[PDB]
């Protein structure tokens, strides 16, 4: 299993503008378009993203293209971030996927806000980091996904996804 497969499980795939768990306009594989209430602001962001007139709908190829860009951007952001980079470098391959997952869903900033959990992952205190990660809005708002990512951190295997 790889990052793409993991995130595809967590975000699903939709070819028409949709609202995410938070009520924000999204398309494809978790590609956030806008936080603006306007469906028109979304359609416009969509056209800009695709470079064509989409009218709120895209093909699977287009969805996958956006997906490739988003994962690449997530990874490059972690590698450029002073707070994230060191955690990342310290982890094993599977657990690195889990940090990418969080950054994809919640942005660099968000993640960088989990100070204490980050410190615990760095020290490799798995069970304790797991407990701390759960004490978050993230866990309360999307418990099944959070559980999956959290289990990945705790065990270092893909069991939660299998
Ligand atoms: Cl809490
Ligand atoms: Cl969930």
Query: Is 104 part of any known ligand binding site?
Result: yes
List the chain domain ranges: 1-162
User: Are 28 and 66 spatial neighbours (Cβ–Cβ below 8 Å)?
Assistant: yes
The bound ligand whose nearest atom lies closest to the alpha carbon of 9 is 2
At 19 the three-state DSSP class reads strand
DSSP structural state of residue 22: T
DSSP structural state of residue 130: H
Q: How far is the CA of 137 from the centre of ligand 1 (A)?
A: 6
Look up the CATH architecture of domain 1-162. Answer: Orthogonal Bundle (1.10)
Give the residue from 112, 116, 110, 118 showing the smallest Cα distance to 141.
110
How far, CA to CA in Å, does 51 sit from each of 47, 55, 68, 84? 5, 12, 16, 32
Cα 68 to Cα 108: distance, rounded to the nearest angstrom: 17
The pairing of beta strand 14-19 with beta strand 31-34? unpaired
Cα torsion 67, 73, 76, 77: sign: negative
**DSSP string across 57-84:** B--HHHHHHHHHHHHHHHHHHHHH-TTT
Side-by-side strand order, sheet with 31-34: 14-19, 25-28, 31-34
The bound ligand whose nearest atom lies closest to the alpha carbon of 146 is 2
CA–centroid distance for 70 within its chain = 9
How was this model experimentally determined?
A: X-ray
Q: What's the token pair of residue 133?
A: 């990660």
Tell me the catalytic residues: 11, 20
Q: What is the number of H-type helices and E-type strands within the chain?
A: 9, 3
Cα 96 to Cα 125: distance, rounded to the nearest angstrom: 15
* Residues shown for the chain: 162
Q: Is 26 exposed, middle or buried (0-12, 13-18, 19+ CB in 10 A)?
A: buried
- Other beta carbons less than 10 A from residue 12's beta carbon: 11
- Other beta carbons less than 10 A from residue 157's beta carbon: 13
User: Are 99 and 88 spatial neighbours (Cβ–Cβ below 8 Å)?
Assistant: yes
Query: Is 117 part of any known ligand binding site?
Result: yes
Cα 61 to Cα 128: distance, rounded to the nearest angstrom: 41
Query: Is 132 part of any known ligand binding site?
Result: yes
Cα 116 to Cα 162: distance, rounded to the nearest angstrom: 29
Q: How far is the CA of 133 from the centre of ligand 1 (A)?
A: 9
Q: For residue 37, which phi and psi values (nearest 5 degrees)?
A: -65, -15
Cα 27 to Cα 129: distance, rounded to the nearest angstrom: 32
Q: Name the resolution in angstroms.
A: 1.8
Q: How far is the CA of 134 from the centre of ligand 1 (A)?
A: 7
Give the residue from 44, 50, 42 showing the smallest Cα distance to 66.
50
């Amino acid at each position: 299993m790889n990052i793409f497969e993991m995130l595809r499980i967590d975000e699903g795939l939709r070819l028409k503008i949709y609202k995410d768990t938070e009520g924000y306009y999204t398309i494809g594989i978790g590609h956030l378009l806008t936080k603006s209430p306007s469906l028109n602001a979304a359609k416009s962001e969509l056209d800009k993203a695709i470079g064509r007139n989409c009218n709120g709908v895209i093909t699977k190829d287009e969805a996958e293209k956006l997906f490739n860009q988003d994962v690449d951007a997530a990874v490059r952001g972690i590698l450029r971030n002073a707070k994230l980079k060191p955690v990342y470098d310290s982890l094993d391959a599977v657990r690195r996927c889990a940090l990418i997952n969080m950054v994809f869903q919640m942005g660099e900033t968000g993640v960088a806000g989990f100070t204490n959990s980050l410190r615990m992952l760095q020290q490799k205190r798995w069970d304790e980091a797991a407990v701390n990660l759960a004490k978050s809005r993230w866990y309360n708002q999307t418990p099944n996904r959070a559980k999956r990512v959290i289990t990945t951190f705790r065990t270092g295997t893909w069991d939660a996804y299998k």
